[PDB]
Amino acid sequence: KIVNIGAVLSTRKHEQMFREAVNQANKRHGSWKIQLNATSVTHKPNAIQMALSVCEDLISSQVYAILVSHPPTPNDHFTPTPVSYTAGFYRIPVLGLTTRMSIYSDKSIHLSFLRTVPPYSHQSSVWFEMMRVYSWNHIILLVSDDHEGRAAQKRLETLLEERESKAEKVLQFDPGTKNVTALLMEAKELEARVIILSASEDDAATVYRAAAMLNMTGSGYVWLVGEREISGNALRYAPDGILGLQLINGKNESAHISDAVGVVAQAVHELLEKENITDPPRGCVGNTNIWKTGPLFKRVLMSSKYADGVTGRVEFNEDGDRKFANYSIMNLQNRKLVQVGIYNGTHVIPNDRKIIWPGGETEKPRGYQMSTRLKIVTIHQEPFVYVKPTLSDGTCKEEFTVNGDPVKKVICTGPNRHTVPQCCYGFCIDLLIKLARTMNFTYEVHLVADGKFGTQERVNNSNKKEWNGMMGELLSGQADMIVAPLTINNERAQYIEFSKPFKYQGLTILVKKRITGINDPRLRNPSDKFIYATVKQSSVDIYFRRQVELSTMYRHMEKHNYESAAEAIQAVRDNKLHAFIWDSAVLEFEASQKCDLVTTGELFFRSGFGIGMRKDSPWKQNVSLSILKSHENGFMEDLDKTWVRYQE
Amino acid sequence: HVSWRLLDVVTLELGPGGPRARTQRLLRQLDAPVFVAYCSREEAEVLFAEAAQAGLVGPGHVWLVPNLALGSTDAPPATFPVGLISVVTESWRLSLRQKVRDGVAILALGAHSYWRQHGTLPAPAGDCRVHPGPVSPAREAFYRHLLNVTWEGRDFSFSPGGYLVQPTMVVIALNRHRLWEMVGRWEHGVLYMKYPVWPRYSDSRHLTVATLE
Amino acid sequence: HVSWRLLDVVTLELGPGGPRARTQRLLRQLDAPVFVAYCSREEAEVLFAEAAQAGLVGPGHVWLVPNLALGSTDAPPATFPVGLISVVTESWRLSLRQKVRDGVAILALGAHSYWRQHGTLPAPAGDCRVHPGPVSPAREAFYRHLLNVTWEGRDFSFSPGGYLVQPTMVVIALNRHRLWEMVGRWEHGVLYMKYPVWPRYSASLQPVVDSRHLTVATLE
Ligand SMILES: *[C@@H]1O[C@H](CO)[C@@H](O)[C@H](O)[C@H]1NC(C)=O
Ligand SMILES: *[C@@H]1O[C@H](CO)[C@@H](O)[C@H](O)[C@H]1NC(C)=O
Ligand SMILES: *[C@@H]1O[C@H](CO)[C@@H](O)[C@H](O)[C@H]1NC(C)=O
Ligand SMILES: *[C@@H]1O[C@H](CO)[C@@H](O)[C@H](O)[C@H]1NC(C)=O
């Protein structure tokens, strides 16, 4: 049988190469069972005329496949579209020898399209592999507003979210812009120092100039770029040691032709044995139909492999990707590029000399350039954090103790409108003193701006929910640590990470001297005899809301509750409130301290206290180790007996 | 804000009647009171035909599909379930002359809205044989002004993506007449319903129950 | 006790002559991590070759067959998946001479056991040409006493049907080097295994390990 295939090129010299390739492929199987032909058409400066030329070529024979290549024209974006649209109207499978645009992977717009070279968006897997190998966790991604850049950023973010790691900060700039030092300045104020760049050559050169002017190209930084940012005028001026990647034998425009011809021949050899010989369409005007087995041929060609290609074993992904083509690591060794390693997308194998870095050092740089001056946020709670006003001399009054040592005090500013300075001291302040002395850092304590502990909530006329209070301040970046009696819950643990607990506690009842645990119908059902309340925007509100069986009790609580503190203890004292529910230690200290107050029953739901920290912060391991060693030393027992047990 | 507890998601592969075995097994082990399907008009005649053999077309079950299917709204085909809810754009019952008049009116309304600015009446490009239009001249103001022009009290705000943003859409269903009928509009983001209770017209299920005080 | 959720049962013409395309289509549409197959040796080779064609033999699935297939037990042919599981009775590796020694021993003990009862050996009845004989009580009693036997620590107890009951089966599997090997014994209704987890091999060997499986240590 006579089998006809087509191709489109622009060399008029590699067309002879294509003819030789198809002849050699027919030499593999030439028993007249299947016979191969060849046709070719040259490019034109006019897109419409090229479309009718492809129409004439398709009506010339019973073509089964189309091969398209890149002409010497500088418009590489829309070059293969005039053929692709007309071919996909009839569902004629096509192959792209050299093409990198990421618009042809949308199968819903381009019905039939294949490819043999990895498009630009698949570098993200290599970047993720390099990050995993080098163990760089906190990264910054800078991209453009183009579709390809947005898609690549989305793919990288999807991979990170699958790893459940996310990105430290993502910032994008509009294409074709200059004097954009604002974005670099914004990105330079973060602890993480590794830059991922993806833009055009001119944008790359402008960004390199801005970064060089901003001194961010020196030591301690490691920035990697793709393949399009290390070519042309961009490669002229660039910091030394910039990591990069390149294709194995890309832009050859002749090595892939043989592989494409062999794959087409192999696919059509198996396709010809099918019962449905649809006789691919021959007609361009009046033929308002499609090829009956076009999808079948496309599926067969997609799942057809090769034995020994010039570029290696050839396979197809779910959309026609190159299926693990090679990649070559690059570098900037004193204005000259060099190969440093070879990776095929699965693993990297360093088989060259050492790699230099922008600062000129040989040691491998680490990200997360740690600071030494952290801000600390806290809340006003009686047994733990005492807030007092300062004297006129600038220091709040000294207060010795019976033990023979003075109480440590620090100056805390922030509280309400006002931002007056005060003095803070107590349990958590002593713990902070010891922690900072152990781990060698400096602190600047302040208070919250709302008074609430922090509770997730979604405001009206919006779909995003933002934390309020102390928790919202931590995520927003105003505070780097939370030294306060902050309980640990699942919702809190979703977005931050805590240390090991340093105190265990629960919830109990405070009543002025029939009241019992939460089982009585007097508590299950509303009544004027007994009234219970909490502090709103807190953890107890979430606990009683996260229970369908307690909806009535939640409604009764939501009828009225205090946005307050020990003032609620006074409200209980003034006989306005019948009973109180709160954390065990807070209620117990006041019950055993002043007078005439008794805790009812015992704990019913237990939880611990912990320091809050941002996601995957580097401070976690040392904080946990120090807390544990202070548990076992006996220091926490001394602190407990000093601050909580000196009563009754 | 609702809980919206989903049961399962199934991806089928249905086409010509050769590979039509795994899909039947996949659909046989799935049960739900409400289904949301996504297929073309050329695959509905297969998916509903297969569902009808697995007990998925009874009055106890309801369906909901987008406007991608049911292309021939004038003559609905057979094997379709009775009472399938779909959403269509405004003027689904309008005539072809009405549609042409509306399009011409929108285009001329944009042209006259620019004419009220007394700037110009921009001319089109030359032809195809020269491949013109290398850059975008000041004529982009015409395209910009052709977006937010309304007509006859109908919002025609076109999004930058080429699709209209918030006209009014209605809900249609197949009654016991093999004819689609309107159910409720969605004007100003408030849902209207013609039926306070679903009719569920026509072994069985969905038995009625009574209690009192 | 377990529910044993069945997935699908299929019957196909796996004979010397038939439409291979239909069977290819039916095999191409299946989804289950465990297969149980029943066929003859030629049918087994055809089915396994077809499964290898339609990608159902990789490290993802497991096959099981009774002793009817697999033939000689000393010459596993091609296209037989590595990891095939079968169940064969004891003495699957003895010699031909050893088997005959068991055959004469069981007859000898049967006569000896009957000898203690009545002190005789029943006379032969071998007129093939005449073909006489209604129901005979002496030979019937000898056959009834012939059922149960025990010697050398091996219990041979024949059911009324001509098959032995309560044997000690041994499970065998195809090693990575194309050789039958023992995997797990069975003795009075309790099963043992050599491996605490099922070894899974690949096309180029290098036994793969399941990503979502882990080992947990503890004590009492
Ligand atoms: C603390 O920091 C100082 C310098 O800031 C250093 O000399 C000292 O060794 C550090 N101690 C610890 C325990 O890190
Ligand atoms: C934690 O302690 C180790 C040594 O104990 C130290 O090398 C490391 O820098 C500390 N972590 C941080 C984030 O400072
Ligand atoms: C419609 O868009 C044009 C943009 O050129 C703008 O000038 C005009 O104010 C808009 N009309 C309304 C009602 O917003
Ligand atoms: C079964 O075994 C017993 C024990 O030796 C023997 O006496 C008897 O003859 C055997 N056969 C029958 C049918 O009981």
From Swiss-Prot, chain A:
Protein name: Glutamate receptor ionotropic, NMDA 1
Binding site for glycine: 485, 487, 492, 539, 583
GO terms for cellular component: cell surface; cytoplasm; dendrite; dendritic spine; endoplasmic reticulum membrane; excitatory synapse; monoatomic ion channel complex; neuron projection
Disulfide bonds listed in the record: 55-284, 396-423, 412-424
Chemical reaction(s) catalysed: Ca(2+)(in) = Ca(2+)(out); Na(+)(in) = Na(+)(out); K(+)(in) = K(+)(out)
Organism of provenance: Homo sapiens
GO molecular function, one term: amyloid-beta binding
Location of the protein in the cell: Cell membrane; Postsynaptic cell membrane; Postsynaptic density membrane; Synaptic cell membrane
Biological process annotations from GO: brain development; calcium ion homeostasis; calcium ion transmembrane import into cytosol; calcium ion transmembrane transport; chemical synaptic transmission; excitatory chemical synaptic transmission; excitatory postsynaptic potential; ionotropic glutamate receptor signaling pathway
Membrane topology label: Multi-pass membrane protein
Whole-protein coverage range: 25 to 797 of 938
Residues that carry a glycan: 37, 179, 215, 252, 276, 326, 344, 416, 440, 460, 525, 622
UniProtKB/Swiss-Prot annotation, chain B:
Name of the featured protein: Glutamate receptor ionotropic, NMDA 2C
Subcellular location(s) per record: Cell membrane; Postsynaptic cell membrane
Biological role: Component of N-methyl-D-aspartate (NMDA) receptors (NMDARs) that function as heterotetrameric, ligand-gated cation channels with high calcium permeability and voltage-dependent block by Mg(2+). Participates in synaptic plasticity for learning and memory formation by contributing to the slow phase of excitatory postsynaptic current and long-term synaptic potentiation. Channel activation requires binding of the neurotransmitter L-glutamate to the GluN2 subunit, glycine or D-serine binding to the GluN1 subunit, plus membrane depolarization to eliminate channel inhibition by Mg(2+).
Family stated for the protein in its record: Belongs to the glutamate-gated ion channel (TC 1.A.10.1) family. NR2C/GRIN2C subfamily.
Free-text note regarding domains: A hydrophobic region that gives rise to the prediction of a transmembrane span does not cross the membrane, but is part of a discontinuously helical region that dips into the membrane and is probably part of the pore and of the selectivity filter.
Gene from which the chain derives: GRIN2C
Subunit structure and binding partners: Heterotetramer. Forms heterotetrameric channels composed of two GluN1/zeta subunits (GRIN1), and two identical GluN2/epsilon subunits (GRIN2A, GRIN2B, GRIN2C or GRIN2D) or GluN3 subunits (GRIN3A or GRIN3B) (in vitro). In vivo, the subunit composition may depend on the expression levels of the different subunits. Interacts with PDZ domains of PATJ and DLG4. Interacts (via PDZ-binding motif) with SNX27 (via PDZ domain); the interaction is required for recycling to the plasma membrane when endocytosed and prevent degradation in lysosomes.
Source species, domain of life: Eukaryota
Positions annotated with a glycan in the UniProt record: 148
Curated annotation (Swiss-Prot), chain C:
Subcellular location: Cell membrane; Postsynaptic cell membrane
Tissue: Mainly expressed in brain with predominant expression is in the cerebellum, also present in the hippocampus, amygdala, caudate nucleus, corpus callosum, subthalamic nuclei and thalamus. Detected in the heart, skeletal muscle and pancreas.
Domain characteristics, as noted in the entry: A hydrophobic region that gives rise to the prediction of a transmembrane span does not cross the membrane, but is part of a discontinuously helical region that dips into the membrane and is probably part of the pore and of the selectivity filter.
Complex formation: Heterotetramer. Forms heterotetrameric channels composed of two GluN1/zeta subunits (GRIN1), and two identical GluN2/epsilon subunits (GRIN2A, GRIN2B, GRIN2C or GRIN2D) or GluN3 subunits (GRIN3A or GRIN3B) (in vitro). In vivo, the subunit composition may depend on the expression levels of the different subunits. Interacts with PDZ domains of PATJ and DLG4. Interacts (via PDZ-binding motif) with SNX27 (via PDZ domain); the interaction is required for recycling to the plasma membrane when endocytosed and prevent degradation in lysosomes.
Gene: GRIN2C
Protein name: Glutamate receptor ionotropic, NMDA 2C
Family named by the database record: Belongs to the glutamate-gated ion channel (TC 1.A.10.1) family. NR2C/GRIN2C subfamily.
Glycan-modified residues: 148
